[PDB]
Design a protein around this motif. Structure first.
Motif, PDB file in Angstrom:
ATOM      1  N   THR B 303      10.903  25.565 -34.978  1.00 13.63           N
ATOM      2  CA  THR B 303      12.189  25.115 -34.643  1.00 13.63           C
ATOM      3  C   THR B 303      13.210  26.215 -35.063  1.00 13.63           C
ATOM      4  O   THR B 303      14.029  26.698 -34.270  1.00 13.63           O
ATOM      5  N   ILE B 304      13.145  26.747 -36.309  1.00 11.96           N
ATOM      6  CA  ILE B 304      14.065  27.670 -36.894  1.00 11.96           C
ATOM      7  C   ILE B 304      13.975  29.418 -36.326  1.00 11.96           C
ATOM      8  O   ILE B 304      14.939  29.944 -36.266  1.00 11.96           O
ATOM      9  N   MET B 306      13.627  31.332 -33.249  1.00 11.91           N
ATOM     10  CA  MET B 306      13.419  31.474 -31.816  1.00 11.91           C
ATOM     11  C   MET B 306      14.283  32.719 -31.464  1.00 11.91           C
ATOM     12  O   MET B 306      15.367  32.749 -30.991  1.00 11.91           O
ATOM     13  N   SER B 344      20.172  29.667 -31.737  1.00 15.04           N
ATOM     14  CA  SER B 344      18.639  29.518 -31.753  1.00 15.04           C
ATOM     15  C   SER B 344      18.086  28.622 -32.868  1.00 15.04           C
ATOM     16  O   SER B 344      17.049  28.224 -32.760  1.00 15.04           O
ATOM     17  N   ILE B 345      18.626  28.886 -33.892  1.00 14.29           N
ATOM     18  CA  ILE B 345      18.017  28.526 -35.343  1.00 14.29           C
ATOM     19  C   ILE B 345      18.148  26.729 -35.566  1.00 14.29           C
ATOM     20  O   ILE B 345      17.178  26.419 -36.265  1.00 14.29           O
ATOM     21  N   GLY B 346      18.970  25.995 -34.785  1.00 16.25           N
ATOM     22  CA  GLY B 346      19.918  26.421 -33.550  1.00 16.25           C
ATOM     23  C   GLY B 346      19.176  25.359 -32.629  1.00 16.25           C
ATOM     24  O   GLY B 346      19.109  24.002 -32.719  1.00 16.25           O
ATOM     25  N   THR B 347      18.811  26.059 -31.414  1.00 17.39           N
ATOM     26  CA  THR B 347      17.937  25.474 -30.432  1.00 17.39           C
ATOM     27  C   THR B 347      17.171  24.345 -30.896  1.00 17.39           C
ATOM     28  O   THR B 347      16.613  24.698 -32.076  1.00 17.39           O
ATOM     29  N   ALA B 348      16.758  23.322 -29.951  1.00 20.75           N
ATOM     30  CA  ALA B 348      15.539  22.679 -30.248  1.00 20.75           C
ATOM     31  C   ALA B 348      14.051  23.301 -29.885  1.00 20.75           C
ATOM     32  O   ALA B 348      14.257  24.341 -28.868  1.00 20.75           O
TER      33      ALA B 348
HETATM   34 NA    NA Z   1      15.588  26.272 -33.102  1.00 25.51          NA
END
Ligand code: NA
Ligand SMILES: N[C@@H](CC(=O)O)C(=O)O
Ligand SMILES: N[C@@H](CC(=O)O)C(=O)O
Ligand code: NA
Ligand code: NA
Ligand code: NA
Lengths: 411, 411
Positions: B303-304, B306, B344-348
């Motif tokens: 997840t973190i 990306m 992005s860290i952030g994004t799913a």
């Molecule tokens: Na993410």
């Protein structure tokens, strides 16, 4: 305190000024400031102009159907319809023929590949018809409803008329009292439509103030190309078709615009045919046409005859098929005309619902709204929208007036 | 019945095949056909691979944290942290530096002019952290919640360890039973991730089948430039940083890529970091890394970290500003970097939520989403999206593996 400078000076004065205040404040990023401070004055205008539509259309039509022959409504009507359709149909092919001559959308490369689909379609006609016959006319009035109001006032004027040639001459008394007072109103409203109209100068400045701030900026590149082909196309309808159809029906083309602008300018800046109507109607009267005509060709034209919408609807439908490189060609070219007539007849009488209608005409050919690049292109048009909308409305109205004057110089 | 041809032959065989089936079916307008008939095979794949995530993450993290020192967890974590951030921050600048090198958006003319606005902002940090603490671990499992599970397995493993060092040697028996059976599970799931994966060939064929059907055709003109500059930009994150940070930390770069692809081709095709994870974790184990590491640097990097998303998020924010001609320059260039990291860290960990996240990073600079040409350009991007997302996800995971391998080569 002007005290009274002439209106077509101050009106045309605020138009060319607020267009420049708007364009300057808009391109220097203030359009929100403009929508805060200016806008509500360009609102108050349209506010007052609406306030009248409901009485002035009902009143004027009772009278006018009383003071004309049931035979002749029914002729003037079949006339205006087959004139209305023919004008609407011409404006689409005059739009296609502008997006062919210009080329908006082409030169933004963006193709996509899926349709139809399937797709669907069918205007519920039966229901639109049964709907012009209202079931509470007090109702109909009470909330907008101009078309069902028309079909009452026409039914009422016809019946009063009949009341006046009746044996017992107590009812003919009542029949008069009613029809007098009804005319009392109608006449009153045409006095108010002058009231507002001394406000118009302000309202017109503060309308293109806002419309030019918040969307002038978008008139750029390939979008600018969609404006020009539409604008040069609308002011080619005026010349190629109206002035010709006025000249031919021996009504003076330049004296006609001489009637004006008033309704030509409230149409432009309001972008509301329904909001224009009072002014549109008061330039029917003031130009001498007969009330049993103009109070039924104009409230019907205000919705059914939108030449300017079904033109931009032509040329917008071209832009979004050009930006995807989908060449539309024989069959679709012809099924744009049909459906953009449909889509405008069609559209509502208020701001950019013609743009929302543009969807019905896209879906008519290949492209369906769901495809990102379809929608990407449509979005772009939805930024040049109110700028098209102005000229669109001013011809949606000027075709109603020429429709009226040319039918009534035959009757 | 293959009987069993080699997987990295049949996996790589369907990919180049279905991508040509897809593109041929797609540009011939069949994308629906492929999403009706093909797609559900592409799905089944991602179905199965998900089925595993919840157990294999929990089970393996109880074990590995029981099989490492609280001390070490401490160091590896903070190691991977300032590792992930450092990689994420670079990928954006490697993105800008691609969108500066190519020029996507410039050459589509469409400017706009209202901002900021005001605007808003503030990730509710307080709440996201408080959250990593679940309040029913059974819960967190029973419904997705991988980050709250992490924080349970980590505290469970350390507590188990602790019980094995306790006076009463009835409890060290129970502590064993538990940790054993837990590893029973984990081990099991890693056998199952092999099961599926013999399906992947089909799964892989049937995923790019559709993604290429349904979006390939959009890769054209100004959009085609956004792809190339992301794609050549992503495969320049691989060589420039990974192969260099592998080479530098004494781990073989081409023998790292030899570990694979497996997780590199599950990443690409699925476009789901989360869905990949089982194959990402069994490529951690199968490449010899220690469980008390990989079983905590993969579900977290999943997840973190990306890199690929914060790479496109840079180069897409450029496209939309370039299509508007709004030049971003010094301070924004740098407030893209911070935010596209954040985003992005952030994004799913699931498909194109990064494309939705692209909004946050757009809002941070000038342009606001409300303006048609902002949304017009964004739309176009939303049409090339899962095509980006592919390469994106493969480097969101490749940097998760290099982030694990180079930290455990230092632990
Ligand atoms: Na993410
Ligand atoms: N606002 C327009 C309708 C349109 O063309 O969008 C009108 O009054 O005619
Ligand atoms: N689909 C991506 C997220 C993104 O970049 O949109 C992932 O699974 O990592
Ligand atoms: Na009209
Ligand atoms: Na209409
Ligand atoms: Na990741």
């Amino acid at each position: 305190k002007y005290i009274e400078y002439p209106v077509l000076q101050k009106i045309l004065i605020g138009l060319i000024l607020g267009a420049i205040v708007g364009l300057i404040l808009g391109h220097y990023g203030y359009a929100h400031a403009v929508h805060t401070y200016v806008k509500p004055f360009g609102d108050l205008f349209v506010r007052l102009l609406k306030m009248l539509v409901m009485p002035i259309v009902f009143a004027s039509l009772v009278v006018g159907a009383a003071s004309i022959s049931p035979a002749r409504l029914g002729r003037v009507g079949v006339k205006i319809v087959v004139y209305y359709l023919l004008t609407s149909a011409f404006a689409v092919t005059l739009g296609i023929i502008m997006a062919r001559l210009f080329n908006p959308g082409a030169g933004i490369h963006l193709a996509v590949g899926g349709q139809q689909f399937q797709p669907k379609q069918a205007p519920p006609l039966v229901h639109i018809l049964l709907d012009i016959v209202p079931t509470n006319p007090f109702g109909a009035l009470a909330n907008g409803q101009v078309l069902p109001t028309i079909f009452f006032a026409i039914i009422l004027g016809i019946a009063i008329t009949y009341l006046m040639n009746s044996e017992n001459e107590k009812v003919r008394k009542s029949a008069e009292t009613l029809l007098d007072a009804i005319n009392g109103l109608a006449e009153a409203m045409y006095k108010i439509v002058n009231g507002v109209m001394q406000y118009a100068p302000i309202g017109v400045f503060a309308l293109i103030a806002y419309v030019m701030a918040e969307q002038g900026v978008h008139v750029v590149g390939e979008l600018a190309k969609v404006t020009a082909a539409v604008y040069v196309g609308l002011t080619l309808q005026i010349l190629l078709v109206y002035f010709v159809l006025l000249k031919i029906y021996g009504i003076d083309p330049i004296s006609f615009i001489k009637h004006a602008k008033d309704a030509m300018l409230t149409a432009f800046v309001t972008r509301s045919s329904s909001g224009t109507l009072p002014v549109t109607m008061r330039v029917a009267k003031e130009m001498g046409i007969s009330e049993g005509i103009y109070s039924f060709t104009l409230p019907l034209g205000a919705t059914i005859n939108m030449d300017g919408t079904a033109l931009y609807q032509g040329v917008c439908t071209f832009f979004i098929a050009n930006a995807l490189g989908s060449h539309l060609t024989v069959g679709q070219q012809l099924t744009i005309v049909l459906t953009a007539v449909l889509a405008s007849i069609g559209t509502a009488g208020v701001p950019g619902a013609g743009a929302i209608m543009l969807a019905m005409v896209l879906h008519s050919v290949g492209l369906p709204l769901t495809d990102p690049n379809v929608a990407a292109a449509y979005a772009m048009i939805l930024g040049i929208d109110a700028i098209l909308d102005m000229g669109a409305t001013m011809v949606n109205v000027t075709g109603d007036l020429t429709g009226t004057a040319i039918v009534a110089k035959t009757e």
